[PDB]
């Protein structure tokens, strides 16, 4: 679906923070004893509203909330870290968890270049068949 932001306002700029998974490379800063404290592991940046992507994302977060809350109702886990990993697993089971039927809408295998290789090799023996 396309996202049409239907909120009263939209802040069009996203001043963000995230973590640096490899925050140091040289020296002893990778050693926990010498490295930064909890407050200093973050990097920052600024994104603008090209293609209205910020305004779309805010609405998306809004619409995700209901389904997310219902998911949390059904689990007995105290802290859930596995939603994206389970999505990845479901992706894999969707494509390769069963038999892949070629030309079907759910099998993503292309033999078209493999078609140009076997349709060019039709002529490898049929033209020189003396």
């Amino acid at each position: 679906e396309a996202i049409v932001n239907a909120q009263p306002k939209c802040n069009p700029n996203l001043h963000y923070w995230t973590t640096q998974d490899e925050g140091a490379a040289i020296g002893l800063a990778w050693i926990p004893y010498f490295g930064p404290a909890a407050e200093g592991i973050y990097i920052e940046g600024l994104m603008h509203n090209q293609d209205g992507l910020i305004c779309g994302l805010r609405q998306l977060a809004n619409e995700t909330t209901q389904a997310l809350q219902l998911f949390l109702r059904a689990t007995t886990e105290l802290r859930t870290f596995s939603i994206l990993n389970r999505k990845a697993i479901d992706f894999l089971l969707q494509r390769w968890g069963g038999t892949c039927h070629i030309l079907g809408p759910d099998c993503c295998i292309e033999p078209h270049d493999w078609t140009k290789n076997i349709t060019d090799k039709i002529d490898q023996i049929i033209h020189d068949f003396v």
Partner: antibody
Amino acid sequence: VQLLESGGGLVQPGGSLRLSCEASGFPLRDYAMSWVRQAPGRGLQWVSTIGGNDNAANYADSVKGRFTVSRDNSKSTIYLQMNSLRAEDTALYFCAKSVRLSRPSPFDLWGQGSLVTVSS
Amino acid sequence: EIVLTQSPATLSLSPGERATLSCRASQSVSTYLAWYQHQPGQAPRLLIYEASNRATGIPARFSGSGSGTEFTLTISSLEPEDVAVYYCQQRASWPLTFGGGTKVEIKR
């Protein structure tokens, strides 16, 4: 319910012009509103959509940086402010109402169209 | 963009006949596809949404079918008032795109 468009006519290339579209018979704040244009002898091309807030605008690539769509819900009016107009922009411009605010289509009500001609 | 291609380009049919119009997408749009009628110099009118749902006030002869990359609009029995251009439109992704239209002529 009706959509009445206005503001069309002749304008020189490089100029600015603001179009308006007035809604009647329904509360404007509940629906996403769009602009669609029809060049002579051609089909329909989507131009822009505005959602619930003035910053929730989406544009065709060929109008980005040149056209701005906006709304004034208190006066029940939609606007299209155009700048840097070219010969390719002469067209009949339609306003279009969505069935809801949070998705851009189906277009269940259309205005009659206002013609904007950019020509020397 | 997702390109929408409508076929055929022209249709000349007598009243009472069935008309079948087709819209094809370059990649799947699932069921996010609507059809609009535009008769000469009047405002366009919504006919069908979500590939198969008939809009309010539209005659029962109009129906829609299809999914994925293939969709059809059927008019089961033509009357003179259906002379118009018909457009499909997808809403799965920005930019919104329209088909090129089908002009239906009534052969009286």
